[PDB]
Design a binder for these strands. Sequence first.
RNA 1: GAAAUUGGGCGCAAUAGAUAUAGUACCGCAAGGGAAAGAUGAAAAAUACCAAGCAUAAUAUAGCAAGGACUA
Length: 45
Amino acid sequence: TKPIPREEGPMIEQLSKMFFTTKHRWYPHGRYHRCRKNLNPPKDR
RNA sequence: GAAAUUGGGCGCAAUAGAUAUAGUACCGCAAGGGAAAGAUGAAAAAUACCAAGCAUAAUAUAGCAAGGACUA
Ligand SMILES: [Mg+2]
Ligand SMILES: [Mg+2]
Ligand SMILES: [Mg+2]
C-alpha cells in the first residue's frame, strides 16, 4: 500500500475531452423526448 | 305456357326518408340536368369533456419508427 497523499462548441469539446466520450450526448434533445421520460421510475433495492 | 273445373307501422329521422326549405339556386341555345342547408330557452318585453387539423410545446447521430427492455 501507498501512504495517503496530502460557448456551446468549446464547452462540448471540453466535456468530451474531460469524460472521454463523444460530442453527441452533450447536445440537448427536443420536447418530445424530454416529456416521454419517466421522472418517477420504479426503484428496487 | 293455358283452359274446362274450383271458389295503422319489430318505417325513416336532416349524407336517412321524397329531388324537395325547391323542380328553386345553378348549369344548358334548347329538350333537359338539378343542389345544398335547420337545431337556445317556459320567457330573448330574460343575451364543459370528444375526429382529423392546429396551438399550449420545433429539432439532436441510426434508419416501416416499433418490440425486448431498462435507473433512464
Ligand atoms: Mg335527395
Ligand atoms: Mg383532436
Ligand atoms: Mg438499429
